[PDB]
Amino acid sequence: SFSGYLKLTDNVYIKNADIVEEAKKVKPTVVVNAANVYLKHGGGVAGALNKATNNAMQVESDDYIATNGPLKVGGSCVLSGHNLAKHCLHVVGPNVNKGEDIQLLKSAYENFNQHEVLLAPLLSAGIFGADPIHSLRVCVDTVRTNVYLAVFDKNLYDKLVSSFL
Contacts of 32 (CB under 8 A, 6+ apart): 88, 89, 90, 91, 112, 118, 119, 120, 121, 123
- Alpha-carbon span 121 to 88, nearest angstrom: 12
Resolution of the PDB structure in angstroms: 1.1
**90 near 35, Cβ under 8 Å?**
yes
Please report which residue ranges of 27-153 form alpha helices under DSSP H.
Answer: 44-52, 56-68, 104-110, 132-142
> Measured between alpha carbons, how far is residue 71 from residues 40, 42, 56, 64, 136 in Å?
11, 16, 19, 10, 23
Q: What is the largest CA-CA distance in the chain?
A: 45
Task: Give 42's Cβ-side CA count (13 Å radius).
Answer: 6
Query: What determination technique applies here?
Result: X-ray
Q: Position 75: which residue type?
A: G
Pairing of strands 12-16, 30-34: unpaired
